[PDB]
Design an enzyme around this catalytic site. Structure first.
Site, PDB file in Angstrom:
ATOM      1  N   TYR A  88       1.003  -1.268   0.063  1.00 34.81           N
ATOM      2  CA  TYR A  88      -0.065  -0.143  -0.114  1.00 34.81           C
ATOM      3  C   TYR A  88       1.139   1.164   0.135  1.00 34.81           C
ATOM      4  O   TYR A  88       1.647   1.255   0.845  1.00 34.81           O
ATOM      5  CB  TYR A  88      -0.989   0.133   1.053  1.00 34.81           C
ATOM      6  CG  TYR A  88      -2.000  -0.877   1.203  1.00 34.81           C
ATOM      7  CD1 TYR A  88      -3.109  -0.999   0.580  1.00 34.81           C
ATOM      8  CD2 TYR A  88      -1.734  -2.283   1.526  1.00 34.81           C
ATOM      9  CE1 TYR A  88      -3.979  -1.828   0.333  1.00 34.81           C
ATOM     10  CE2 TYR A  88      -2.616  -3.291   1.439  1.00 34.81           C
ATOM     11  CZ  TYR A  88      -3.679  -3.116   0.794  1.00 34.81           C
ATOM     12  OH  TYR A  88      -4.495  -4.448   0.496  1.00 34.81           O
ATOM     13  N   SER A  89       0.746   2.213  -0.927  1.00 36.21           N
ATOM     14  CA  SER A  89       1.516   3.351  -0.888  1.00 36.21           C
ATOM     15  C   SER A  89       1.444   4.215   0.303  1.00 36.21           C
ATOM     16  O   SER A  89       0.067   4.383   0.809  1.00 36.21           O
ATOM     17  CB  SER A  89       1.163   4.316  -2.020  1.00 36.21           C
ATOM     18  OG  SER A  89       1.216   3.507  -3.274  1.00 36.21           O
ATOM     19  N   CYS A 265       0.200   7.476 -10.741  1.00 34.43           N
ATOM     20  CA  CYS A 265      -0.010   6.370  -9.954  1.00 34.43           C
ATOM     21  C   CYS A 265      -1.374   6.272  -9.793  1.00 34.43           C
ATOM     22  O   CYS A 265      -2.300   6.958  -9.737  1.00 34.43           O
ATOM     23  CB  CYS A 265       0.454   7.020  -8.486  1.00 34.43           C
ATOM     24  SG  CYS A 265       0.468   5.799  -7.102  1.00 34.43           S
ATOM     25  N   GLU A 305       3.925   4.174 -11.002  1.00 30.53           N
ATOM     26  CA  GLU A 305       3.657   3.003 -10.316  1.00 30.53           C
ATOM     27  C   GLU A 305       1.894   2.928 -10.337  1.00 30.53           C
ATOM     28  O   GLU A 305       1.376   3.505  -9.523  1.00 30.53           O
ATOM     29  CB  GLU A 305       4.278   3.485  -8.779  1.00 30.53           C
ATOM     30  CG  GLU A 305       3.802   2.210  -7.768  1.00 30.53           C
ATOM     31  CD  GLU A 305       5.288   1.888  -7.120  1.00 30.53           C
ATOM     32  OE1 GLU A 305       5.521   2.739  -6.045  1.00 30.53           O
ATOM     33  OE2 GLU A 305       6.090   1.289  -7.529  1.00 30.53           O
ATOM     34  N   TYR A 307      -1.097  -0.207 -10.696  1.00 32.43           N
ATOM     35  CA  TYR A 307      -1.246  -1.486 -10.045  1.00 32.43           C
ATOM     36  C   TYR A 307      -2.660  -1.970 -10.329  1.00 32.43           C
ATOM     37  O   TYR A 307      -3.461  -1.209 -10.928  1.00 32.43           O
ATOM     38  CB  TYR A 307      -0.934  -1.562  -8.460  1.00 32.43           C
ATOM     39  CG  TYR A 307      -1.513  -0.612  -7.757  1.00 32.43           C
ATOM     40  CD1 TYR A 307      -2.729  -0.403  -7.210  1.00 32.43           C
ATOM     41  CD2 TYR A 307      -0.712   0.807  -7.660  1.00 32.43           C
ATOM     42  CE1 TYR A 307      -3.424   0.561  -6.695  1.00 32.43           C
ATOM     43  CE2 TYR A 307      -1.399   1.956  -6.674  1.00 32.43           C
ATOM     44  CZ  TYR A 307      -2.572   1.664  -6.264  1.00 32.43           C
ATOM     45  OH  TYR A 307      -3.070   2.939  -5.707  1.00 32.43           O
TER      46      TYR A 307
HETATM   47  C1  LIG Z   1       3.097  -0.733  -5.249  1.00 30.94           C
HETATM   48  C2  LIG Z   1       1.489  -0.970  -4.790  1.00 30.94           C
HETATM   49  C3  LIG Z   1       1.004   0.009  -4.245  1.00 30.94           C
HETATM   50  C4  LIG Z   1      -0.621  -0.252  -4.083  1.00 30.94           C
HETATM   51  N1  LIG Z   1      -1.327   0.959  -3.290  1.00 30.94           N
HETATM   52  C5  LIG Z   1      -2.312   0.780  -2.879  1.00 30.94           C
HETATM   53  C6  LIG Z   1      -3.134   1.772  -2.237  1.00 30.94           C
HETATM   54  O1  LIG Z   1      -2.423   2.812  -2.002  1.00 30.94           O
HETATM   55  N2  LIG Z   1      -4.176   1.555  -1.855  1.00 30.94           N
HETATM   56  C7  LIG Z   1      -5.196   0.507  -2.316  1.00 30.94           C
HETATM   57  O2  LIG Z   1      -6.257   0.471  -1.830  1.00 30.94           O
HETATM   58  N3  LIG Z   1      -4.535  -0.578  -3.114  1.00 30.94           N
HETATM   59  C8  LIG Z   1      -3.218  -0.545  -3.414  1.00 30.94           C
HETATM   60  N4  LIG Z   1      -2.565  -1.541  -3.962  1.00 30.94           N
HETATM   61  C9  LIG Z   1      -3.452  -2.737  -4.170  1.00 30.94           C
HETATM   62  C10 LIG Z   1      -2.939  -3.644  -2.803  1.00 30.94           C
HETATM   63  O3  LIG Z   1      -1.787  -4.098  -2.978  1.00 30.94           O
HETATM   64  C11 LIG Z   1      -4.161  -4.795  -2.911  1.00 30.94           C
HETATM   65  O4  LIG Z   1      -3.968  -5.364  -4.101  1.00 30.94           O
HETATM   66  C12 LIG Z   1      -5.576  -4.447  -2.969  1.00 30.94           C
HETATM   67  O5  LIG Z   1      -5.958  -3.914  -1.815  1.00 30.94           O
HETATM   68  C13 LIG Z   1      -6.449  -5.617  -3.066  1.00 30.94           C
HETATM   69  O6  LIG Z   1      -5.759  -6.693  -2.184  1.00 30.94           O
HETATM   70  P1  LIG Z   1      -7.177  -7.585  -1.125  1.00 30.94           P
HETATM   71  O7  LIG Z   1      -6.215  -8.333  -0.478  1.00 30.94           O
HETATM   72  O8  LIG Z   1      -8.061  -6.755  -0.754  1.00 30.94           O
HETATM   73  O9  LIG Z   1      -7.645  -8.540  -2.417  1.00 30.94           O
HETATM   74  P2  LIG Z   1      -7.183 -10.208  -2.734  1.00 30.94           P
HETATM   75  O10 LIG Z   1      -7.909 -10.768  -1.394  1.00 30.94           O
HETATM   76  O11 LIG Z   1      -5.694 -10.074  -3.239  1.00 30.94           O
HETATM   77  O12 LIG Z   1      -8.143 -10.207  -4.083  1.00 30.94           O
HETATM   78  C14 LIG Z   1      -7.681  -9.716  -5.218  1.00 30.94           C
HETATM   79  C15 LIG Z   1      -8.920  -9.308  -5.980  1.00 30.94           C
HETATM   80  O13 LIG Z   1      -9.595 -10.660  -6.394  1.00 30.94           O
HETATM   81  C16 LIG Z   1     -10.904 -10.584  -6.293  1.00 30.94           C
HETATM   82  N5  LIG Z   1     -11.292 -12.024  -5.845  1.00 30.94           N
HETATM   83  C17 LIG Z   1     -10.886 -12.717  -4.615  1.00 30.94           C
HETATM   84  N6  LIG Z   1     -11.226 -14.083  -4.866  1.00 30.94           N
HETATM   85  C18 LIG Z   1     -12.058 -14.139  -6.014  1.00 30.94           C
HETATM   86  C19 LIG Z   1     -12.476 -15.251  -6.437  1.00 30.94           C
HETATM   87  N7  LIG Z   1     -12.673 -16.270  -5.957  1.00 30.94           N
HETATM   88  N8  LIG Z   1     -13.213 -15.190  -7.603  1.00 30.94           N
HETATM   89  C20 LIG Z   1     -13.334 -13.754  -8.070  1.00 30.94           C
HETATM   90  N9  LIG Z   1     -12.845 -12.618  -7.772  1.00 30.94           N
HETATM   91  C21 LIG Z   1     -11.992 -12.889  -6.854  1.00 30.94           C
HETATM   92  C22 LIG Z   1     -11.382  -9.906  -4.868  1.00 30.94           C
HETATM   93  O14 LIG Z   1     -12.451  -9.222  -4.888  1.00 30.94           O
HETATM   94  C23 LIG Z   1     -10.149  -8.759  -5.244  1.00 30.94           C
HETATM   95  O15 LIG Z   1     -10.697  -7.786  -6.138  1.00 30.94           O
HETATM   96  C24 LIG Z   1      -1.076  -1.188  -4.242  1.00 30.94           C
HETATM   97  C25 LIG Z   1      -0.287  -2.243  -4.775  1.00 30.94           C
HETATM   98  C26 LIG Z   1       0.717  -2.176  -5.317  1.00 30.94           C
HETATM   99  C27 LIG Z   1       1.489  -3.358  -5.970  1.00 30.94           C
END
Ligand SMILES: Cc1cc2nc3c(=O)[nH]c(=O)nc-3n(C[C@H](O)[C@H](O)[C@H](O)COP(=O)(O)OP(=O)(O)OC[C@H]3O[C@@H](n4cnc5c(N)ncnc54)[C@H](O)[C@@H]3O)c2cc1C
Length: 307
Positions: A88-89, A265, A305, A307
């Site tokens: 998360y940034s 970003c 950056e 994602y």
């Molecule tokens: C450098 C960088 C910076 C970032 N900065 C931010 C930031 O500032 N703020 C931010 O909000 N995010 C940010 N992100 C994204 C963050 O890292 C996460 O990817 C994001 O919050 C979702 O992760 P999660 O664990 O909620 O979803 P996960 O549990 O990883 O799920 C990923 C997606 O899959 C969907 N999904 C899960 N299971 C299923 C299934 N069985 N069938 C269908 N769909 C499914 C979920 O609903 C979700 O949309 C950043 C990523 C990077 C790489």
């Protein structure tokens, strides 16, 4: 009694390189949640929350970096293994929202799953880390790793540089930290006198993040800050960030030719539209966007950056 807020401790300015990977996945630092608040109104398409975490000074970072969060539970498919890190940034400066070097903040959008056909939600498919984060309460513990990233570090060698910041959604995070450092905090060794221009694309008015803060800089630093918004469901083909950039294309090009840094970003999906627009603009001027882009990359002015 001046306008810049005092921050401490100033020894955070002494490091010569940014901290990287101070805590790693196998042995994360356990931080504590101080507060969690929703940043959006009723009409936003989904919740985006602001989370302040107390790291007690043990996980310092520079503006533009990210913290990794390991949500509790077992890896859905790595029996006995921990959940993978989500990045998360960081949305605060190195001194943090309480100006004391003990806290950092995240700007997190809840990833919610809806059946496309029935529009029905299915919580078993919601994103794990984002919902865990926006569901947290004061006193809850979080496992942090990092910090990580060097792409979005702010180039400070020229305090009068030009910085054009283009964000969509949570991509505004690093820019909130750049701007507080440029305008709000009393940092003796970094006195910004250049031009910072923020373009922010969101769904609608109720989805704007930190609007009050950015609007205020307009009134205090009218000569050093510009701010333009694009609401994809409430503005002037509807309105995306690329459209605003198009509107000011001559200025932007002129600034880039003069050495400005440009940053993008947010959601990777924003990139294709922007690149189409820039090529079309270049073409109208009789320039090759491809050649311009190669030059901006060579000169290190292009920072992305997504994602
Ligand atoms: C450098 C960088 C910076 C970032 N900065 C931010 C930031 O500032 N703020 C931010 O909000 N995010 C940010 N992100 C994204 C963050 O890292 C996460 O990817 C994001 O919050 C979702 O992760 P999660 O664990 O909620 O979803 P996960 O549990 O990883 O799920 C990923 C997606 O899959 C969907 N999904 C899960 N299971 C299923 C299934 N069985 N069938 C269908 N769909 C499914 C979920 O609903 C979700 O949309 C950043 C990523 C990077 C790489």
């Amino acid at each position: 009694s001046r306008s810049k807020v005092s921050v401490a401790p100033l020894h955070l300015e002494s490091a010569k390189e940014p901290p990287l990977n101070t805590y790693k996945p196998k042995e994360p630092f356990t931080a504590t949640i101080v507060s969690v608040e929703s940043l959006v109104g009723p009409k936003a398409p989904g919740e985006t929350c602001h989370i302040v975490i107390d790291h007690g000074g043990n996980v310092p970072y520079w503006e533009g970096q990210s913290y990794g969060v390991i949500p509790p539970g077992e890896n859905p498919k790595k029996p006995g293994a921990p959940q993978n890190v989500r990045l998360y940034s960081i949305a605060s400066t190195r001194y943090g929202d309480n100006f004391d070097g003990r806290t950092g903040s995240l700007c997190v959008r809840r990833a919610v799953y809806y059946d496309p056909e029935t529009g029905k939600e299915d919580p078993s498919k919601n994103g794990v880390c984002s919902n865990f984060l926006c569901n947290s309460k004061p006193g809850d513990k979080i496992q942090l790793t990092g910090p990580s990233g060097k792409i979005m570090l702010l180039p400070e060698e020229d305090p009068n540089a030009t910085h054009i910041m283009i964000a969509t959604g949570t991509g505004v995070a690093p820019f909130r930290g750049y701007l507080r450092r440029m305008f709000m905090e009393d940092v003796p060794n970094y006195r910004f006198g250049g031009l910072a221009w923020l373009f922010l694309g969101v769904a609608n008015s109720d989805s704007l993040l930190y609007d009050e803060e950015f609007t205020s800089y307009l009134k205090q630093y009218p000569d050093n800050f510009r701010y333009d918004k694009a609401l994809s469901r409430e503005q002037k083909g509807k309105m995306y960030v690329q459209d605003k950039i198009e509107e000011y294309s001559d200025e932007i090009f002129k600034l880039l030719d003069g050495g400005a840094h440009i940053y993008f970003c947010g959601l990777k999906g924003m990139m294709p539209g922007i690149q189409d627009t820039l090529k079309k603009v270049a073409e109208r001027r009789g320039e090759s966007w491809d050649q311009k882009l190669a030059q901006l990359k060579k000169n290190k002015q292009w920072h992305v950056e997504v994602y």
